Ligand binder design. Sequence first.
Ligand SMILES: Nc1ncnc2c1ncn2[C@@H]1O[C@H](COP(=O)(O)OP(=O)(O)O)[C@@H](O)[C@H]1O
Ligand SMILES: Nc1ncnc2c1ncn2[C@@H]1O[C@H](COP(=O)(O)OP(=O)(O)O)[C@@H](O)[C@H]1O
Ligand SMILES: Nc1ncnc2c1ncn2[C@@H]1O[C@H](COP(=O)(O)OP(=O)(O)O)[C@@H](O)[C@H]1O
Ligand SMILES: [Mg+2]
Ligand SMILES: [Mg+2]
Ligand SMILES: [Mg+2]
Lengths: 106, 371, 371, 371, 22
Amino acid sequence: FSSLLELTLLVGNYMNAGSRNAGAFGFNISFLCKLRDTKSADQKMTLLHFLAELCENDHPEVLKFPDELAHVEKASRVSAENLQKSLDQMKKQIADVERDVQNFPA
Amino acid sequence: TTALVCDNGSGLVKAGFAGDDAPRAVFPSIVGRPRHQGVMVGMGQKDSYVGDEAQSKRGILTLKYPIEHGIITNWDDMEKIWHHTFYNELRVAPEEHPTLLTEAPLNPKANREKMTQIMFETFNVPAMYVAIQAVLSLYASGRTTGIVLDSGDGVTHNVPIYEGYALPHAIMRLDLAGRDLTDYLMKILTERGYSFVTTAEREIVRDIKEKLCYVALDFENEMATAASSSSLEKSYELPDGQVITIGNERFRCPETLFQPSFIGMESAGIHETTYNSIMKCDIDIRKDLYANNVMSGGTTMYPGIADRMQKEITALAPSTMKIKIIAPPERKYSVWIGGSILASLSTFQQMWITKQEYDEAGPSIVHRKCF
Amino acid sequence: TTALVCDNGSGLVKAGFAGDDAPRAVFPSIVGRPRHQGVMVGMGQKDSYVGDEAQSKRGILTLKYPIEHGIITNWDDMEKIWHHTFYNELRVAPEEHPTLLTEAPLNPKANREKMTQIMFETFNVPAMYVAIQAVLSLYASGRTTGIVLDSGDGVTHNVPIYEGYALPHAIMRLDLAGRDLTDYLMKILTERGYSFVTTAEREIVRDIKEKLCYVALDFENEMATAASSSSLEKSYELPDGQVITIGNERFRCPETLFQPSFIGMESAGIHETTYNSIMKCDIDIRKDLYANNVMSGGTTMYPGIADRMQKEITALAPSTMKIKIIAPPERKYSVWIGGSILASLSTFQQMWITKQEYDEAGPSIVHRKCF
Amino acid sequence: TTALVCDNGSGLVKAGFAGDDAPRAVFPSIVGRPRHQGVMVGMGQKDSYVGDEAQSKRGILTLKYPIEHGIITNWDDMEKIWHHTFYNELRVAPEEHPTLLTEAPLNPKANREKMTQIMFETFNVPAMYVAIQAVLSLYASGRTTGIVLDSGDGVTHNVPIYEGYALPHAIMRLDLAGRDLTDYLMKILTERGYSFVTTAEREIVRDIKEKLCYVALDFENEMATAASSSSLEKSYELPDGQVITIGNERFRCPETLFQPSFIGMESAGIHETTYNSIMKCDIDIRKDLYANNVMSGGTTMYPGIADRMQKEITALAPSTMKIKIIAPPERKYSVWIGGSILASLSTFQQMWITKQEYDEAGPSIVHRKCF
Amino acid sequence: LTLAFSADSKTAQNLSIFLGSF
Ligand SMILES: Nc1ncnc2c1ncn2[C@@H]1O[C@H](COP(=O)(O)OP(=O)(O)O)[C@@H](O)[C@H]1O
Ligand SMILES: Nc1ncnc2c1ncn2[C@@H]1O[C@H](COP(=O)(O)OP(=O)(O)O)[C@@H](O)[C@H]1O
Ligand SMILES: Nc1ncnc2c1ncn2[C@@H]1O[C@H](COP(=O)(O)OP(=O)(O)O)[C@@H](O)[C@H]1O
Ligand SMILES: [Mg+2]
Ligand SMILES: [Mg+2]
Ligand SMILES: [Mg+2]
């Protein structure tokens, strides 16, 4: 995936040459879904389809990166804010029960 | 006296007394009439057989269901069902007994008008009531809030109820239930060479679906398992002594509930229906509807429906919410059972529709009084 | 190389070259075996006669139909039928010609399995295909949309197709056609004293039904006309010399098609079957199915059936819609004509099931390649 | 060089040449896809029908709207809408004419970004503009100031503009328009027993809502009139030939616009939305907005809306200031007429977003150039 | 990649809108 990010940076700097984004040292990872929108002149292939054809021809060792990223599908649906709110409510309820243990009569 | 709970469902009439644990008289609602030539004089040859007598003699009868998709088409047949469940099975006098009735939501109003007219003129009770089936299923489950997927023989409806209030705008009705599954099984049994075209064969195919069918957890892997080897094949003995064998059709037949595009219906399955019924409600009450899915009705008795329903709902919903499927073992009669909760209440004595209110207001007080 | 169109119907095999206007070889599908003791030595006494030779020598043979209700029962008789129609009738080599075969809708799958197995292994072809007869009838009618009633000797089916998109949940199949009409004519001819019990007498009763029967426009008026005066009575010459006279049985024999309760079948007539097949479709296309009732097959060659069908559908439909029964004059062989439409098309050449795909996938690719 | 005005609303695409009085191409924005099994070979069976061809062949297609609640969800479907309204409807090449486009207020900005990117990469014009629909509706009213209640098929928004200055804080948005009225009519048409569940039936219910529905003046008096006598009932003929008759549901269907508690929306009616949008402005400019209630969109084409609107605003506002409702009969195409007015002006030549400005600033200069 | 991906004022305005409407 890091070799794919180096390949996308080289091809996209040649495409953005003379533009505002010329000589870009890096791009945001949220822009990777917007590689499909860059269509060709005859509108038959995308920039994603050109990069998939380039990795199928020259560098076929890149293509095993969906097999490494197995838990990304599980990690896409998990909210860190709801985990923080659940753990704060867990810590509050443990401290409430332990206070109810300490305030329990004989 | 003791009130009567008579669930007049599309397939099975379940009748009994108030406050009882089990319904006393469970029988299918069919009207059988003979089609061949009666050559023997005498012998008690009635022109019509109602209930279990038509089931026992079904080889020489044409069987008609008086209720189709929750709408009573034939009304004299419905009067014969009501007379059979009042006088033959229950053996009471309905002129001195209150009788609660159930009704599917999003019904035409004139069905309730004619039900009120028949129950107040021909079968003239002192009091009656028309109740929503999902409210009775949630009463039998014991909880006050939650969303009920009730699927009888004709009507599959998702109704959410919050704090005892049945929300009207999120009620989602799909006309896909066990009679469509029976007709689809009659269609797909001709792939192996078995022909079932008569109405007497419909009960045999219904018993095959009742005894041998199940919902697969994954449809494609179970289809590949049934195609790869015959480890899922099950046999059945026909009443003439012949033996049939079925493979993947045990789970292709209740897959119509999760994929209605097989029989040509455009609308989606019951999980997307439940998700769209929940998402039509407010955002503050969905956590009480995500973890309170109560299933009811005779269609929901496959041994794969809770796991597949929970998997599809948890695939549809955001993952930070609790998904719980309340699946009681007595769900198939639970629409009756909560009515026995409702007829035994102290607060329900003022909610009865009496004869004086009917004689004052016509058959129009049942729309204003009942929900 | 020209393709071959071979409609293996339940009654009559119609085979010939693709692109021809008329089928080259039309012969009935019977296999005759000698039931009497052979006493003369030599003389070429064969133990089996096929088709026309079985029809000419039918006085000393037992005739067996290999196909009953669209299902092939005896497979060795079907291989004898296929070898006779490949080598004796057409005089063609099957190793250099593709072959198109037809099948009834809602046929059992093993019939298509064994048909594919026999056509690739015994009479091995470079390519073959299995099509649907009603789609070939809609090809032969020249239109795009319409509902097809195709009725041969065993299978009567309604298939609605709109704009090249068939609706598979509205396909209706009834096992009631001209063989049951021949058996009912044999049943009702014993009231006048004429007995027909052998298999050689079934050809005589079938020829009586072909030459003398007609569909009444109204049944009660024609029954009162036949009961009052002897104007509808017709006389037929049997080959032994006797002359019979028939009265109302000219029109009572095809009344089984519109009233199937005469032979004990609980299902409704062909007009209610076509009306229920239209009414199960979507609501925007029913007007285009009211105007294109395409008929085919030899059962719909009666000279009273189109006006009776138009009268019954016009009595069933709402009155603001046109009811038109498309009846071409060559509707008996028209399915074969559709095969000569389909095999001559240049776009069909990518849809052949080759021998390489058969040897790759077994005889199970025919379900995923055809309809 | 004639410009193009193309309102890509939720209801119907309205596109044509600038400087004209009526739009050349008015067609609904749906994409139809086939759902059944294609059986006829050849003849050019497309996989997607766009525009009026999907409306004509709607009995075999599933219809998908590319715009839902004013926001473009599907983008390849919207590209097919733009390709059909450029190449097939107007039959002009898009890269030689400048194009004006309409957009709802309070939009997410990525809709504008992707619209600019698609119009500058796929259909790359020399110049384009994106305008607010309420400003174009006020430009076609013959004036400059006033408040526009623009109600399309998904979005009903009140925008007040004083002296050409659109006030952003007083813009109010309610998600209750003609698609929700159509779904509420599908909900209440099942009370009489006329079930409509498919997407093809929604066009028939929308035709019923267009042709037969009207806004009542008093809700309780019209409900008592419909409950008293059957004088308000109207008949409709379905495309299959059936005839339905409706009573009070002619005026209960647009009563959701003035009582949004019928479908379960917490916000108040559109008159109260207009009153709160005017009351969010300054106290000195309210008298101009009280007499300049301009209505637009196809939802405001009911023949009862202006009297009810004037009565509700006069009951809401104090009686010292004059209440006037502006309802032109050409308000269905008033967004296109205002775009044709604005596009032909010589002051608008400096306000074009050119190709070089897109090459300099990306697809993000439409946020800083327009309002 | 070259072969594949080759590429007063206020009153005068309001009167012009008024004259465009009329
Ligand atoms: N064990 C089972 N598995 C699957 N389906 C069942 C089972 N038992 C009953 N059914 C189906 O449920 C239907 C009965 O549902 P029920 O709610 O009793 O209908 P009703 O009350 O309307 O007569 C039957 O038509 C049958 O097809
Ligand atoms: N001229 C006719 N009049 C009436 N019935 C006919 C006529 N010709 C054929 N039939 C009936 O139609 C049947 C032949 O139909 P066909 O489609 O050729 O059957 P198949 O193709 O299955 O052999 C015969 O069984 C016969 O009973
Ligand atoms: N005479 C009418 N009465 C009631 N509603 C109408 C009438 N004519 C059109 N409509 C409704 O208006 C809608 C068209 O609105 P439109 O101006 O196209 O909105 P948009 O451009 O945002 O899609 C249609 O969906 C239709 O339901
Ligand atoms: Mg039930
Ligand atoms: Mg035939
Ligand atoms: Mg619009």
